[PDB]
Amino acid sequence: FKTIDARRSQHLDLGGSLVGPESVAFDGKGRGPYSGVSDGRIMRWNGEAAGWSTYTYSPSYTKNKCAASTLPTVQTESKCGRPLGLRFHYKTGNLYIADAYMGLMRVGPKGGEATVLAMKADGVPLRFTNGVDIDQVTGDVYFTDSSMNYQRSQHEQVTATKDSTGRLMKYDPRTNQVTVLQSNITYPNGVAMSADRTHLIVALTGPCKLMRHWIRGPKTGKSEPFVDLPGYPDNVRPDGKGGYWIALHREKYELPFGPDSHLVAMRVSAGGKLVQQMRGPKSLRPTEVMERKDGKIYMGNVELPYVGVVK
């Protein structure tokens, strides 16, 4: 597993002044990246020719006439929503959205306006709904809230202040219920279920760590250290080979490796060992890394006006 070069990469441009396709989710039919962008919409990629089509959005997006808003998105975020985490339930074709302001939402295979499933957990409202993954067998949804204090706009303040008010939660699609599995977490972000489905791997952005929370067997409810990372992790996604790709939006240590050779992602094994690194420009600031069958690796962010593609 040689270091992947992210210097040369194809840009799937978003229209208008849209930026920050934080997640790069693929549906059960393998259709091109679905991405939650700066203005509150979840856009779908349909190739070079057709480009990005609107797929889904929060009820607040419609209600507040956000489509015809003139003001910069950083200001109209809490009104229009900011979709971060994306994952498809293959059996139904449903898309689960982790929206920073609008909480956990879901939409059908046809798309259109989404439905808010949860905006609160144990009476406390969700202020920074970030990471999501699905148990593909049961349809259970595991998602994170990064802070009770700071909204997405001040995500850097979660790190700066060492804020530890984050929550890891389960949404049960049968009982329509939201349980808090773990609270007082230091900036929980990305979440991925393990291949063997016994635990979750959760990214702690500020701490620069992955942790393991068990969801099955005698250790159910136990959170433990998994591995320390030399970068600030965002989203955790399976690499399609039993491990995970971890997006690293910043390095913890600026190692002098010459120009445009910054650590922007790490492939981690099921056992929590460092397998492979991806180095590229500092501007990439990746939030999600999605390897595919055809060797291509799709990359999300919160700042750039495109999805990046390497290999």
Numbering used by the authors: 38 to 348
Sentences from the paper on this structure:
The crystal structure of TGW6 was determined at 2.6 Å resolution and exhibited a six-bladed β-propeller structure. According to the result of structural similarity search, the structure of TGW6 was classified into six-bladed β-propeller structure. Furthermore, some proteins with structural similarity to TGW6, such as diisopropylfluorophosphatase (DFPase), gluconolactonase (XC5397)23 and drug resistance protein 35 (Drp35), retain calcium (Ca2+). In contrast, the highly conserved Ca2+-binding motif in structurally similar proteins was not completely conserved in TGW6, and a Ca atom was not found at the site using single-wavelength anomalous diffraction. Therefore, these results implied that the Ca2+ ion does not bind at the partially conserved Ca2+-binding site in TGW6 or that the binding affinity was very weak even if the ion interacted. Firstly, the docking pose of IAA-Glc was simulated when the IAA portion of the chemical structure bound to the inside of the molecule around phenylalanine (Phe)-165, histidine (His)-192 and tyrosine (Tyr)-224 in TGW6 (subpocket A; the interior portion of the nipped pocket), whereas that of Glc interacted at the site relatively close to the molecular surface around Glu-193, arginine (Arg)-287 and Glu-343 (subpocket B; the outer portion of the nipped pocket). Notably, the IAA moiety bound to fill the shape of subpocket A, whereas subpocket B still had a vacant space. The interaction map of IAA-Glc in the presence of TGW6 suggested that Tyr-224 was involved with hydrogen bonds, His-192 and His-286 interacted as aromatic-aromatic contacts, and Leu-121, Phe-165, His-286, threonine (Thr)-324 and valine (Val)-339 were engaged in hydrophobic interaction with the IAA substructure.
An indole-3-acetic acid (IAA)-glucose hydrolase, THOUSAND-GRAIN WEIGHT 6 (TGW6), negatively regulates the grain weight in rice. An enzyme activity assay confirmed the IAA-Glc hydrolase activity of TGW6 using recombinant TGW610. From another point of view, the hydrolysis of IAA glycoconjugates by TGW6 has been considered to function in auxin metabolism.
